[PDB]
Amino acid sequence: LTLPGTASAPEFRLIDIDGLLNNRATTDVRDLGSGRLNAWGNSFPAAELPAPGSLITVAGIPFTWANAHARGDNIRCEGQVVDIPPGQYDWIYLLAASERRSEDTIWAHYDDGHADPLRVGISDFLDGTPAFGELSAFRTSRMHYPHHVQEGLPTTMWLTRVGMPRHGVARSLRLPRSVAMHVFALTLRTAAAVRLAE
Amino acid sequence: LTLPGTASAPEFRLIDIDGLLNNRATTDVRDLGSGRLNAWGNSFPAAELPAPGSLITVAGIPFTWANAHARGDNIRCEGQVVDIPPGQYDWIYLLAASERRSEDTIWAHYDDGHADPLRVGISDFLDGTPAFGELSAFRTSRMHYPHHVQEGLPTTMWLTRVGMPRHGVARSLRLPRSVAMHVFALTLRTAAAVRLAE
Amino acid sequence: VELWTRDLGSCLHGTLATALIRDGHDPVTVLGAPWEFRRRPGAWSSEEYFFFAEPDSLAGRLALYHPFESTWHRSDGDGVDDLREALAAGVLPIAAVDNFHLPFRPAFHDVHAAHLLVVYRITETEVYVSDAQPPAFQGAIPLADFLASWGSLNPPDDADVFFSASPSGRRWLRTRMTGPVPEPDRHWVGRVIRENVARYRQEPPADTQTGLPGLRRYLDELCALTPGTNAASEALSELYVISWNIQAQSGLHAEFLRAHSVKWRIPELAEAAAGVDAVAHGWTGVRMTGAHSRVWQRHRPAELRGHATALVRRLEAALDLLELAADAVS
Amino acid sequence: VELWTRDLGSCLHGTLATALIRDGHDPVTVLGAPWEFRRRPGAWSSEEYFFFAEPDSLAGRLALYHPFESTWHRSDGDGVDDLREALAAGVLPIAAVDNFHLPFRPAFHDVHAAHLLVVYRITETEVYVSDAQPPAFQGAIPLADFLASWGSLNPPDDADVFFSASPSGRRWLRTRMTGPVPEPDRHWVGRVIRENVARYRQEPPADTQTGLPGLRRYLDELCALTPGTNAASEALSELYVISWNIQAQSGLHAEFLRAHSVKWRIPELAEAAAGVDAVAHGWTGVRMTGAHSRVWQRHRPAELRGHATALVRRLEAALDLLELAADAVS
């Protein structure tokens, strides 16, 4: 038995993470030596990602591209608490890559003192295969090394979604506790009333 | 930054679980002694629940009420594999109750051989407090005992939702391996593109 | 006199909570601060309110971080003069009763079960009782009905293998807070959590299964018994009884952690609360698999072993989350 | 000559998979059926392709359930005569090479690293090499470049503390299937899973740390060392090297389980696969915390201990899911 549904327009809340940037995963041709996406000092090519501060959509999901500084262009995951506007949410969206594919926990913190551990998988930056049914956010043609631009070696960034099943007001998130995991952008999607089509 | 999303038209797929009914959680006054919602032979009062085979909505979500027989009116959870129509899904919706609140795993099986363990919490049937931010499905005025109808004791059934984050074709679910957990109805909600509003 | 219980809780936490609230104490802080596992072979009684307290008093062990104490009394004679004298001295008696003889209990003249309620007023003809266990009741019952419940032989009952065969024996519990409560500040919560974790991690004595290693040994011993045997039946009866108030304390400890998470906006306490609630929930899988094996001969040894293993893994994870929570408040 | 690798895999599984595919064998079945953890103190070499094989051959241990064998050879002189003879005999030599001297490798004249590739054709002036490691390459390189890589000193390189200081030594691996493969039916997959689980559960007898108990001891030993010391640095270099092909085998075993889950529509194999992948993913947390501590002096003992504890718990959970999978196919 199949019945058509209708869901109201939700709201996207693009989280300003400029204050949490703690790691350089991206370099231009003039600062190849600043790359710390991995232990080997690789990085995404700046030329193959959006301009800092720009509004983008990945599979329709809006993100703000981080206002990078010399010492940070992403969150290398160390269990950072991220304040979010209080509200009822359905989904967390992350633009992310991992130093080899890995899985961990995003905690959602609710007003009533409940916290939910939400499973999150992030696939490899190194010409990765999606292991967690992510969508491709960026698949570059090249990769930056400490001393050269490597032709014909994709650097991969992933769009991952994480459900927030609890009907309650979420106030903050905790990012994973893993040096392997990198978050480039974070967007929340509010709950929207679903019903039968009239 | 706050940005509007789009309205969407997801589809509800009401899963026929009549072949999997293995337990009596509901009785009329004539068959009180058949009650097996718990170890004590309690049950929901049939007179405060929907008609078998009937279409209902709970918080706008459609469900088909089980076509009960003498030996089954719900799935008491024993790791049953439930075949679902192949598709891309967002949410599993269950009408459920637990013999004391508990949490376990629904496995989602995908056509590429990936299986995702999905966290599910189900709150108490015994005048329960929602522990997982579920919505109330039914809160009866009375509860059935082996030998009598108990006045002024609510029997509680919950609407619980479980995210299916993987972008992939799901073909089956495994219910929890827990005798404490009861599933009265199962509705799947298909994926529906929601993007930044133009 | 305030009705107080939780869906995972019994008349044990409920009646103590009423006594604490009467004296202006927060039952979540007092009864929710302690979190432990102990099982003494042979100690359990077929009573809803069984908790292994030795060497502490029953109320003492349930309120381990507070100067809270109880004494058990067996009342001589055929009346309620001892309870009248207790009330006149400002004590709230907690009476050992059989639900079979309580008109407001679903069990009335149907199921024998050893239970606790609060007595808050006595007249020539009526005993005023407070019982928060669903369905909650507060008010007068006939003296004769109270005496019947307070004096019940609570005989072995085929319909209640868990909480029958424990005479009421006109027993009642007197509770007192014998000094001022500790200020439940960040440093106190840190110390409570560290003391709970240290006690869980401690290698147990030979004669008492305590903490994480004790839980492992207890569940291994339990799963080693053959389903349906008299040995298994006795062990599963014990399991259901002891695990009620151990599960109840798990739920209360999670609530205690959530309350302090909200008070100070410290997310580590909410995260720890989730881990502790996972243990509370893990007890459901174990004790209900046990209950159906015991009562309905639903023999699922693979399920019991599965739930037992999940409960241990959840406890391991909870203790690690609790150490992160203690660090966030200490 | 087929390029084959996986994002968790090294040139070890990759080169062996190319050799197996040439002989008409399924590398997912041959290299994915085995799943184990072994660490012998002092056994590891600073090579991308280090795997503890004793007493089996390298290919033997990596294909434990198949009649697959390898022999190491060291070629004397300054030519490729021995490799030409090998090719004429229908062998695909797997040559020990330094990435520093391979023009198609990102490491070319930048980073010394002990690596493997397949040689499939030799002319007077060119060696045709196949290397599936990103970025994948297949074709002729100048004889001089191959000889420079095959004969490389691979001296200690402060840009590569893991895979430098292991001379190529003109070493090459000869692999052969010495009989027909076992038929991979439901019963065979069952036996494979049960033997893997039994080997994981078995306590090691002596200094070689094997299975779940060995992993516990290995990780405890690692976490006990003082960060920044020569001993800790040596241990973290070892950790990163040995864990690559151990993690790679975890990924391949998960793929093997998924493949048979689809083939026979047995969801227990897919569920077990998820459990095994959780171990593969668990290795990432451990080896990358280790790598950043070793290379960038990012000393995070709490993080390393946390990842180590999570990895053990994921392995425990995986073993239970595998036994359920074995029951479903047996």
Ligand SMILES: N[C@@H](CC[C@H](O)[C@@H](N)COS(=O)(=O)O)C(=O)O
């Ligand atoms: N809800 C608890 C306790 C149940 C009681 O023992 C009753 N069987 C008899 O007493 S009654 O008055 O509560 O019905 C459980 O599920 O174990």
Ligand SMILES: N[C@@H](CC[C@H](O)[C@@H](N)COS(=O)(=O)O)C(=O)O
């Ligand atoms: N991707 C692997 C292996 C890295 C290589 O050893 C390179 N550092 C040198 O060789 S290259 O030619 O692949 O760059 C890892 O992350 O450990």
Ligand SMILES: [Mg+2]
């Ligand atoms: Mg005390």
Ligand SMILES: [Mg+2]
């Ligand atoms: Mg402080």
Ligand SMILES: [Mg+2]
């Ligand atoms: Mg062999």
